[PDB]
């Protein structure tokens, strides 16, 4: 009928708009606080700094290497990252490289196109052949770095040109062999019925016999040129023998070992600062994973198939609504200091305070979770990369499918490890809440009783000082026992 008794309710933190996280028991649990681990967003544009980026607007790396006329701006050009656009084309004598990707990767790894000419002596043979496929400027022309040798008078002799190497770096020589389409064309240019081109250093030799066939029409020609490369090391010599069909080099390309590479993309370039480059823009390397693209350049996160991986750093987020009760029905949106709290209602009035001994016990465990996830996924990443490298024996020709299943197995383990910690986080947070309800029940003993809604009903008058005695670990029930039992049993 009056202020004879008081109420002490237990509750926890709660917010209206929580975050959904994955666990093992549930597919999605709304928690109070979490963080995103994948970088699915991107500015869209590529950042010009800190790496030296080179936009090959219309010219591929090979075309700029060889000397396609519209690529002549790229001479001696250097780069940290060469980018190739989709629009890039070739407009020069039709050709083909047997090891295109191998040569493209070799020259890309060296961040330079530094070419120096050399004084080859092609005696008895006319130099600087030309084609109207590459008109160069007003007149006919050819590749910049290639010397097309054609017969002189009515004689094309056997050329044996030697060229030693007396430098500390490695030289890269690019040359070619011309494949005419008729025997008439072969005789007119080279006199001989059948040619040869031989290039060697030391043990290595390459010997190519030209093939007279009619190829698919390109730029008014059914003839083609095959491009080969040859590396000479310090102290080595380059010897070139040919009785015909020789597309000679002008010099060599000085290649340096470096951290350069190449990637195909159409993303625009902008003035910004980004460490990690992806074909669809630049992304910040602050998150552990990224969904933006598979191929990247620079210090980048790991690639992940799914566009979301959230690590729970809170507790079960149950909200409030409509219409006092504790944690059985709804959390407390008003309690913001800590994840476990007390509320009460006594003669003095309603009050509230957080329990930091249990909140700290949860925080101290959640503290090193993100770092723990990063250490484990990194080990599993380089594990899945170390193994899964062999692939049950390999065939270069048809491995397109292996990366598609590497990403799946890696994404499965990563999403599983995040779900392992989220389960552990939900477990330990709910544990500290139930342990608090046990500590208070034990403390009150027969002086109160569980009301069923996460609260107690203290059957004696318990002022704010008495309530703080319950929150503190110092509450003697024996002194209030006689008073509370009098009210009980009545």
């Amino acid at each position: 009928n009056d202020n004879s008794t008081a109420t002490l309710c237990l509750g926890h933190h709660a917010v209206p708009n929580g975050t959904l996280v994955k666990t093992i028991t549930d597919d999605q649990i709304e928690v109070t606080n979490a963080t995103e681990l994948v970088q699915s967003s991107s500015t869209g544009k590529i950042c010009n700094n800190p790496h030296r980026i080179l936009d090959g607007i219309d010219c591929t790396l090979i075309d700029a290497l060889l000397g396609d006329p519209h690529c002549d701006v790229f001479q001696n050009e250097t780069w940290d990252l060469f980018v190739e656009r989709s629009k890039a084309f070739s407009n020069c004598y039709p050709y083909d490289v047997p090891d295109y990707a191998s040569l493209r990767s070799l020259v890309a790894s060296s961040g330079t196109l530094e070419f120096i000419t050399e004084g080859f002596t092609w005696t008895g043979v006319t130099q600087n052949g030309g084609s109207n496929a590459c008109k160069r400027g007003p007149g006919s022309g050819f590749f910049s770095r290639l010397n097309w040798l054609t017969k002189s008078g009515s004689t094309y002799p056997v050329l044996n040109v030697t060229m030693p190497n007396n430098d500390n770096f490695d030289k890269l020589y690019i040359w070619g062999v011309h494949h005419p389409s008729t025997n008439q064309e072969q005789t007119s240019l080279y006199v001989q019925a059948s040619g040869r081109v031989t290039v060697s250093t030391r043990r290595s030799q390459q010997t190519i016999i030209p093939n007279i066939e009619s190829r698919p029409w390109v730029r008014g020609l059914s003839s083609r040129i095959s491009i080969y490369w040859t590396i000479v090391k310090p102290g080595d010599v380059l010897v070139i023998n040919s009785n015909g069909n020789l597309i000679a080099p002008r010099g060599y390309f000085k290649m340096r070992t470096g951290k350069s590479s190449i990637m195909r993309s159409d993303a625009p370039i902008d003035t910004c600062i980004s460490e990690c480059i992806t074909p669809n823009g630049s992304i910040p390397n602050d998150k552990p994973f990224q969904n933006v693209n598979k191929i990247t350049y620079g210090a980048c996160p790991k690639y992940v198939k799914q566009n979301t991986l959230k690590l729970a750093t809170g507790m079960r987020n149950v909200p409030e609504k409509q219409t006092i009760a504790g944690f059985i029905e709804n959390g407390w949106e008003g309690m913001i200091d800590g994840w476990y709290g007390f509320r009460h209602q006594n003669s003095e009035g309603t009050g509230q305070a957080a329990d930091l001994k249990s909140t700290q016990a949860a925080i101290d465990q959640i503290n090193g979770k993100l770092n723990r996830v990063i250490e484990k996924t990194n080990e599993k990443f380089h594990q899945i990369e170390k193994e899964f490298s062999e692939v049950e024996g390999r065939i270069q020709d048809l491995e397109k499918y292996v990366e598609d299943t590497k990403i799946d197995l890696w994404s499965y383990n990563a999403e599983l490890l995040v779900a392992l910690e989220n389960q552990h986080t939900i477990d330990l947070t709910d544990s500290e809440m139930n342990k608090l309800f046990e500590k208070t029940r034990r403390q009150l003993r027969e002086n109160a009783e569980d009301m069923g809604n996460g609260c107690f009903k203290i059957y004696h008058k318990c002022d704010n000082a008495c309530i703080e005695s319950i929150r503190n670990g110092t509450y003697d029930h024996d002194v209030y026992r006689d008073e509370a039992l009098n009210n009980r049993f009545q």
């Epitope: 933190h13 750093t313 949106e333 994840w339 509230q352 909140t359």
Partner: antibody, heavy 126, light 109 residues
């Protein structure tokens, strides 16, 4: 990047009512991510937290015990400010009073006063 | 409530040396709820360390926090003449904020 600007440094006679205001710029008083505190500082008492107010679909106010009786912190949404009233002032209430905002910094909790006002000296003298 | 006691009350140091400020607590304090502030003369307190060991935005690695229970320490590694101020430790217990008396750090010259 909130900017808190408080009222003018003045004089209030003994046994009167202290009354200050904190005009917030760059944030809302009804923010679901902030709490607005009042703190005073004097040579005798030191730094003393007086009270706070925050909005979580409802207006909550907390007060220190030493000042609970004579204080009322009221938020004003229309002017985006919140005021402090202290009553029956005594010469022990001469201090510099600080408007300060608190925001959670650890996993969504552990409110911490990180943005502070300039502080207005008020003297209780007859 | 909980009371915070700072020692020493005054500290004099030559630039380059390291300052260590201790914050003593009547009762055990939650490690996440102890912060340190810097108050330069005529200005409001500026947040330095929060949660015992966590650096705020805009403070260098010279400032680092540590401690647990009733013993918390704040260290300033590479002193500068700009680091003259009064440093306070603050705690939160549930329903109240508490501050220490402060440590006046004056730099020698």
């Amino acid at each position: 990047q909130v900017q808190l600007q408080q009222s003018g440094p003045g004089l209030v006679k003994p046994s009167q009512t202290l009354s200050l205001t904190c005009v917030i710029s760059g944030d809302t008083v009804s923010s679901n991510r902030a709490a607005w505190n009042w703190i005073r500082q004097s040579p005798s008492r030191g730094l003393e937290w007086l009270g706070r107010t925050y909005y979580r679909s409802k207006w909550y106010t907390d007060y220190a015990v030493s000042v609970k009786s004579r204080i009322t912190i009221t938020p004003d949404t229309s002017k985006n400010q919140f005021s402090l009233q202290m009553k029956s002032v005594t010469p022990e209430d001469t201090a510099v009073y600080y408007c300060a905002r608190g925001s959670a910094m650890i996993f969504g909790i552990v409110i911490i006063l990180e943005s502070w006002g300039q502080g207005t000296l008020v003297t209780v003298s007859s | 409530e909980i009371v915070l006691t700072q020692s020493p009350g005054t500290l004099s140091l030559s630039p380059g040396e390291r300052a260590t400020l201790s914050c003593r607590a009547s009762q055990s304090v939650a490690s996440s709820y102890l912060a340190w502030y810097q108050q330069k003369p005529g200005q409001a307190p500026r947040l330095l360390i929060y949660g015992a060991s966590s650096r705020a935005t805009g403070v260098p690695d010279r400032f680092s926090g540590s401690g647990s229970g009733t013993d918390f320490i704040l260290t300033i590694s590479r002193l500068e003449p700009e680091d003259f101020a009064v440093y306070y430790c603050q705690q939160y217990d549930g329903s109240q904020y508490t501050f220490g008396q402060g440590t006046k750090l004056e730099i020698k010259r």
